[PDB]
Structure 1
C-alpha cells in the first residue's frame, strides 16, 4: 500500500490562494506563508495548478517555458523555498503537467510556425485546409474550429483548447524526448507527484478524418481514442517514472469509464491514479454548460461504477470540487445560510470516507459557496467566451440564457479568492483582487472557522484525523448498502475484519435508517448535526436534516 493510497491531498490554485505583494494575484510566498495552516488542518500533500511561465490566456494552462516559474507567482528561488518549507513539515508537492498543448508563445511554436521546413515544424500539427475550409470538422473546447490558419505558411495548426494553446505532436520522437527531459528537470528538484492535465488526448488519429455526426455529438470522447495513447504513456513511464519515486495522476477527460483501467492498472506501468469526470459532471449536459436534474440515486450509482473500475490493481482519486467546477456545497449541498454548514459537513463526511485518495479543493474546508455573478465581466474566462462564440453569436441561445446557466456551472465559482478573515478583501490581498471576493466572506473565513470547535473547518480537521487513524477508511473495500435509495446515502468500508458504516442524510428533513439485517452499531466515531449518538447495539438510526456520521459496526 503506497503512501499515496492513504494520503489526503489539498489542491491550491495559487492564483487565488494568497497574494503577498498587492498585485491582486496569489503567489508562491503567499502559499509558503500558509503551510502551517495547511499542516494544522492535517494535509499530507498539496497539488498546485500550473506554476510555469505563461501568458495566462488560460491561467497557466498555456505554458510558454516549462522550465521557468510563472512571473506572477515569483522566481525559481521562491519555488525552491516552497519545496524546502514543505519538506520541513514532512509535506509533499504534486505539480500539474500540461503537455497536451503549450502556449503559442513557446519558443518551439515560434520556430515551428516560421516555415514548413523548420526543424520544429513537427512539434505541432500542421495541415492544408480541405475545400476552402479547415482540414476537417474538429471542434475546439474553447470555441469554433480546432484548426487555426497561419498566414505565415497558409496551413492550419491544431488546438483542442484555446487558439493560443497549439497541441503538441506526440507522434514525433524528438518532441517526446524533450517532454521527458522536462519532466526529469522537475522530478530532480524532488517533486513528489505529477498530475497530467487531459492525459487522454495526447494521441491524435492519423489522417485526421472528419468526425461522424454521432462522434460530433460527443467530440470529447472521440479525442481520447488516439491509437498510440497507451503506447505513449507506457513509454513515458519507462523513460521517466520508473527511475523516480513520484506518484502519477491522470486527468482522464472525456474517456469512457470502461477505459480507465488502461491508465491506472499498476501492472500496465502507465499511471498511479485516476481523476475522472463521471461524478463531478454527473448532472452536466453534453454542452458542459447546462445542468440536468439528478437525484442521490444517480450520485451514488456513479460512485459505485467508478469504484468498480479500480479493480484490484487500479486506484482512484476522489473529489467533489476543483478549479474547473462550481463549489461543492453549492453543487452537491445546500448553500442557503440555514443549511450551508450542515450540508458542507455532510459533504466533508462523504469526501473523507470514500475509497480512493481524496482531494480537498481550497476553501471547501470553510464551506465557501458559488459566487453571485451580476455582470458580464464577473464571468470572464476563456471557456465562457468560447460558449459565447458557439452558442450566443450563432443564435442558439441568448446571452441571458447563457449567463443564468453559467452562474451555476462557471469555473469562476471556484476561483474567487480564498477567504482568510474579515479584513479588506477577506485578507487575500492588500490590493485589488484579480477576481472579486465573495461578499459572504464576512460570515465565511479561516480566522472565524479555526477559532470555533463547531465550524466546518473543525469538522474537516477531525475527519482527517479519524481517517488517518483508521485503515479501512482509506484502503478498505467499499459497498453501497442501497444504490436505489435517494434520501440517505449509506455505505460500509472494511479492512482486515473491521467494518465502518457511513450514513449521510441528503434531505433537509428528518429521515430514518435501518441497518443491514444482522449488523449493529458498536461505537460512534463522529457525527454532524446530531443531537445524540446512537446507543451501543442500535439496529437503526433516527436522522436529523443533513445529518452525517461514521460508525464502527459489529
Structure 2
C-alpha cells in the first residue's frame, strides 16, 4: 500500500499569525490547540508548524538559540506536549520545521565557537581568514551584504548564507553532525510524525571556499546547493536517525536545479520522503527575488509537468501554492479583485487538491485570504526586505519607492498577516495589538462567515478535501497534462487501477470551451465551481464559465 503521507492533506500553520490567546498580539500553541476542531472539520490529516524553538526572532523562528526548548512566545514545552496530545486525540499528525543549516548567533555553540580558534566548538561553524584585505571570498548573503562577517574576538570571519545573526553550522564536523542527530531524536522520541528540513540542500559547503564565477554569482542560491558532501550527509542522517523511527521527512530544496531533486527523494537512496520545490511557486520571480516577471498558464502547467517528472516510481512531491515565504495564492496565481477572488480561489483549490503529490494548504488560503495593501515602510518589516534595502537601495540600484512597489507583490508579510477568524476586533486573532496588522478585508473574508455558507471558499475546500480522500487516483494516481501548450484552460487526468479522472480549470475571466481528447467522454461530475450546470453524461466537450473548475470521472 501507499504510506499515509501520500494520501494526506497537510495544512501549514504559521503559529505567530494563527491564533493568539494571551493578548500580546503574537499567535501561540494554546491558540493553535484551541482551533484543532476547526482544522479537523476542514478535513486536515496533519499540520506542519513553522519553527517553534527558542529564538531571538531576527527571522521569526528561523534563528534558533536552543533546539530543545520551545519559543517563549508560543508557550512552554507543556503547551507543545498538549498540542501533540490534542492532535493525536483527533487522529491528526504533527510535522515540525527543522532548521539545521544554521543556528542563531545566540546559540551557546556559537557563543563558544567565537571565543578562540582552539575552542572545542570552533568548527561547529565556518571560520576563515579574510583574503586580499577583505572577505574570505565573494559569497553574497540572501539577507544582504557579504555571507562573511568579521568577528574581532578572533579576527576571522564566519559564514552566514542568511542573516548575520544566522551563522551556518558546519556539517563537515562529525561532532556537530552527532549533536544534530541527537537533537532530532529528542523531538522524534516525543512522537513527532514528520519533519520539514529548511533549506536542506545547502548543508554541504565546498572545501576551500573558492570564489563564485560571475555566472554562479548571478545565481548564488543554486551554487550554494552544490556542496560535494550533501547527499553523503543526508544519507548519514537517515541512517543515524530516520531509519529508527516512522516519521515522514520533507526537504525544502531551495535553489537546487530540478534534475537533482531525485537524489533527495528517491526512496531507494534512503534520504528524504518528499520534496518541497520552488520552481512553481517562484515561476514568475526574477533572480533578485523581489521583481516579478509576467508568466502565463502554459509556463505554470509546464513547470508542474517538469516537477511531476522528477518523482519517479520511487520519489514523491508535495504540492503547494503558498507558504509563509511567498505572496498569497489567490493574489499570486488567481485574481484577487472582489469580483473574481472567490471564483479564482475555488479554482486554485481544485488544482491544489487534485495534483499528484501531497498537498499543503497554507493557513488562510482556505478562506481566500489575499495579499495585504501595504501603506507604510513599517508594513514591510522583515529581515529579507531589510537586506534588499542594504543591497539595492543603499547601493543606489533602486529607490525606496521602486523597491516597495515591487515588494508589495512579493513580500513574505503578505502571508504572515493574522488569520481572519471572524469580524470582531482584529478579526478575532487577538484581543490586543497584532504583531502585523490585519488585512482590512477581514470584514468580508473570515472563517466564521465562511463555515456556515455552503457556497464559500471554505466549503469548497472542505468538499474537495472530502473528494480527494474518497478517490485514490486523486492522490496516488498517474498525472498527465492534456495540453501543455494551452494558455487558457488547464486540464489533466489522474489515473489508477483502470479509473481515470479529468480536471478542467479555466484560468481566464471569460467563457472558454474545452474538447476532451478523442476517445474520452464524461461519465460523472464529481464537483464544480462557478458552473451553472454539469456536463451531460457522455460529453465530448465542456462550456466553461469564467474561472470555472471541475473534476469528472471519464470513460
Is TM more than 0.5 here? yes
Offset of residue 405 of structure 1 = 0.3
Distance 1:313 1:116 in 2: 45
Distance 1:280 1:350 in 2: 14
For the residue of structure 1 that corresponds to 2:458, the secondary structure is helix
Offset of residue 551 of structure 1 = 0.1
Residues 48-98 of structure 1: per-residue CA shift (max 9 Å, x gap): 000000000000000000000000000000000000000000000000000
Question: Which portions of structure 1, spanning 4 or more consecutive aligned residues, are displaced by more than 4 angstroms?
Answer: none
For the residue of structure 2 that corresponds to 1:403, the secondary structure is helix
Q: How many residues align?
A: 554
Residues 137-168 of structure 1: per-residue CA shift (max 9 Å, x gap): 00000000000000100000000000000000
For the residue of structure 1 that corresponds to 2:495, the secondary structure is strand
Offset of residue 303 of structure 1 = 0.0
Offset of residue 206 of structure 1 = 0.2
TM-score, scaled to structure 2: 1.00
Residues 290-342 of structure 1: per-residue CA shift (max 9 Å, x gap): 00000000000000000000011000000000000000000000000000000
Distance 1:258 1:98 in 2: 24
Offset of residue 497 of structure 1 = 0.1
For the residue of structure 2 that corresponds to 1:63, the secondary structure is coil
Distance 2:314 2:82 in 1: 36
Distance 1:217 1:321 in 2: 26
Distance 2:298 2:224 in 1: 30
Residues 323-375 of structure 1: per-residue CA shift (max 9 Å, x gap): 00000000000000000000000000000000000000000000000000011
Offset of residue 191 of structure 1 = 0.1
For the residue of structure 2 that corresponds to 1:160, the secondary structure is coil
Distance 1:480 1:108 in 2: 50
Distance 1:543 1:120 in 2: 63
Residues 22-45 of structure 1: per-residue CA shift (max 9 Å, x gap): 000000000000000000000000
Residues 251-272 of structure 1: per-residue CA shift (max 9 Å, x gap): 0000000000000000000000
Offset of residue 532 of structure 1 = 0.4
Offset of residue 183 of structure 1 = 0.2
Give the match for residue 167 of structure 1: 168
Distance 1:465 1:135 in 2: 55
For the residue of structure 2 that corresponds to 1:433, the secondary structure is coil
Question: Does 2:507 align with 1:525?
Answer: no
Give the match for residue 301 of structure 2: 300
Distance 2:463 2:21 in 1: 30
Which stretches in structure 1 are left out of the alignment for 5+ residues?
none
Which stretches in structure 2 are left out of the alignment for 5+ residues?
none
For the residue of structure 1 that corresponds to 2:508, the secondary structure is coil
Residues 481-539 of structure 1: per-residue CA shift (max 9 Å, x gap): 00000000000000000000000000000000000001000000000000000000000
TM-score, scaled to structure 1: 1.00
Offset of residue 131 of structure 1 = 1.0
Question: Does 2:88 align with 1:90?
Answer: no
Distance 2:440 2:225 in 1: 40
Distance 1:175 1:501 in 2: 50
When the two chains are superposed, the root-mean-square deviation of aligned CA atoms in Å is 0.3
Distance 1:167 1:205 in 2: 13
